[PDB]
């Protein structure tokens, strides 16, 4: 057969099972008993906006007592208006306070006031994968593979907890001081036993079953991994158009074209991730994530060494010291204003 090696991989798969069982036990303790109101706004100096998004912004902040830096996500409760915008916000905070994995950003505090919701996380000063990718054009296949391996492991962890991530893309991936990934922006993540039905995500990364209004499952994350790997290795995503509706027609079609510099191993992996037929999509078959981990394109990947952060990264971001924001783009600043009247108190009771 292909391996002569097979005993090492099998023992390795029993160890994965052992790890995930302990991880589930730890997750459930925190999921059932969530932390709440662990800080307040005047505990932090606000320094600079690091990015914006639905409902507010993420700012670099500095804790006054300790001097530690953090990334504070600020959500304007009055912009979180639609039913699934509200539900998604509660998902994000509850999941983040319960997970623990080397490639997931750590939530350190959360709290709310009359006007806003706040989530305070570790600050990752190396910037977004997005910026680095657009600046250098594309990553070589070994470089893309190193990042992809971390997403594979992160999704194996999340899916084992019945969590779907649903917004994979370079904007959501930060590069830490060792050159490894941190996944942030859990605004679309959800705990799902079975199917879910919300039409949500980013157009370029949507699986066909989402676009087609089907009840869908964690396999949408494996589709999105295919989109991410393609975009990392090409410099642009596989379903690329100016308007969302044009993107959706390309996604559903069952067709994908590859750059001439893609290796055949890479194209084979991508054809099996970017597979419209759910009975054929890698990550969704009887062998689960192992069809991905055992694919030829990953043959050089030491999965355990990646998890243990023993592999030398392809790129280390420049860092000038604590609180350095040089790896982030600039955004317009807007003063935080807290109303004297509690807004939307009943919609965010649980936050």
């Amino acid at each position: 057969g292909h391996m002569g090696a097979a005993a090492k991989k099998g023992s390795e798969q029993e160890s994965v099972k052992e790890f995930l069982a302990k991880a589930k036990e730890e997750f459930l303790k925190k999921w059932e008993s969530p932390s709440q109101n662990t800080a307040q706004l005047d505990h932090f100096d606000r320094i600079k906006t690091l990015g914006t998004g639905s409902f507010g912004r993420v700012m670099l902040v500095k804790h006054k007592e300790t001097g530690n830096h953090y990334a504070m996500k600020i959500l304007d409760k009055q912009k979180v208006v639609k039913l699934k915008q509200i539900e998604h916000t509660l998902n994000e905070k509850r999941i983040l306070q319960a997970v623990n994995f080397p490639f997931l950003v750590k939530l350190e505090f959360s709290f709310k006031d009359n006007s806003n919701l706040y989530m305070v996380m570790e600050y990752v000063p190396g910037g977004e994968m997005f910026s680095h990718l657009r600046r250098i054009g594309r990553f070589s296949e070994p470089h893309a593979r190193f990042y992809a391996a971390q997403i594979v492991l992160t999704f194996e962890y999340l899916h084992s907890l019945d969590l779907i991530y649903r917004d994979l893309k370079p904007e959501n991936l930060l590069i830490d001081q060792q050159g490894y990934i941190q996944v942030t922006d859990f605004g679309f993540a959800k705990r799902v036993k079975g199917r879910t039905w919300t039409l949500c995500g980013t157009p370029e990364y949507l699986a066909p079953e989402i676009i087609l209004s089907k009840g869908y499952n964690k396999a949408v994350d494996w589709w999105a991994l295919g989109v991410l790997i393609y975009e990392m290795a090409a410099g642009y995503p596989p379903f690329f158009a100016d308007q969302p509706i044009q993107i959706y027609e390309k996604i559903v079609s069952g067709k994908v074209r590859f750059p001439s510099h893609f290796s055949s191993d890479l194209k084979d992996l991508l054809r099996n991730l970017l597979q419209v037929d759910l009975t054929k999509r890698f990550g969704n078959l009887k062998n689960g994530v192992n069809d991905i981990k055992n694919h030829k394109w990953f043959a050089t990947t030491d999965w355990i060494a990646i998890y243990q952060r023993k592999v030398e990264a392809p790129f280390i971001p420049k860092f000038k010291g604590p609180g350095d924001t040089s790896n982030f783009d600039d955004y317009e600043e807007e003063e935080i204003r807290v109303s004297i009247n509690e807004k939307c108190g009943k919609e965010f009771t649980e936050f």
Partner: peptide, 13 residues
């Protein structure tokens, strides 16, 4: 030809 800037995710398409 397609979008090169940061992409916003949509909560309810």
């Amino acid at each position: 030809a397609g979008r090169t800037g940061r992409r916003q995710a949509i909560h309810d398409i």
